[PDB]
Design a protein around this ligand. Structure first.
Ligand code: CL
Ligand code: CL
Length: 162
């Protein structure tokens, strides 16, 4: 298991524009296109992202290409984030993948707001962090996925994904 397989499990793969769990237009492997209500705006962002007139459909390859960019960007976002980097640096490889998953889902900003959880993780107080992480809208809205990520932080293993 690795970050790519992990997120491919959490996000799925869809080749036609779709609405995510928040009702936003997305495509591929969890690639958000727009928070706007307009399908056109979404088709427009899509074309600009792929570089061709897609008509709201992309191939597997294109989906994977967006995915690789998005994973790269999440990592690079963490490394540039003063609140995030130090956490990330302190973690083992498995747990870093959990932090990346969160950032990919919610954005660097979103994650950087979990101040208390972050400190707990930095301190390696796993059970406590797990409990604090669960007191969030993130957990209440997407509980099955949140449980997977939380177990990952708690145990430092990939069990939740097997
Ligand atoms: Cl893009
Ligand atoms: Cl879920």
């Amino acid at each position: 298991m690795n970050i790519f397989e992990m997120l491919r499990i959490d996000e799925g793969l869809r080749l036609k524009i779709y609405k995510d769990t928040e009702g936003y237009y997305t495509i591929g492997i969890g690639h958000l296109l727009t928070k706007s209500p307009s399908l056109n705006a979404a088709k427009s962002e899509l074309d600009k992202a792929i570089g061709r007139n897609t008509n709201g459909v992309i191939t597997k390859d294109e989906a994977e290409k967006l995915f690789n960019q998005d994973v790269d960007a999440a990592v690079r976002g963490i490394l540039r984030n003063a609140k995030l980097k130090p956490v990330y640096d302190s973690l083992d490889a498995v747990r870093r993948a959990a932090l990346i998953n969160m950032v990919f889902q919610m954005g660097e900003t979103g994650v950087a707001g979990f101040t208390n959880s972050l400190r707990m993780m930095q301190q390696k107080r796993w059970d406590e962090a797990a409990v604090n992480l669960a007191k969030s809208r993130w957990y209440n809205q997407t509980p099955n996925r949140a449980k997977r990520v939380i177990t990952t932080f708690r145990t430092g293993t990939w069990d939740a994904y097997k």
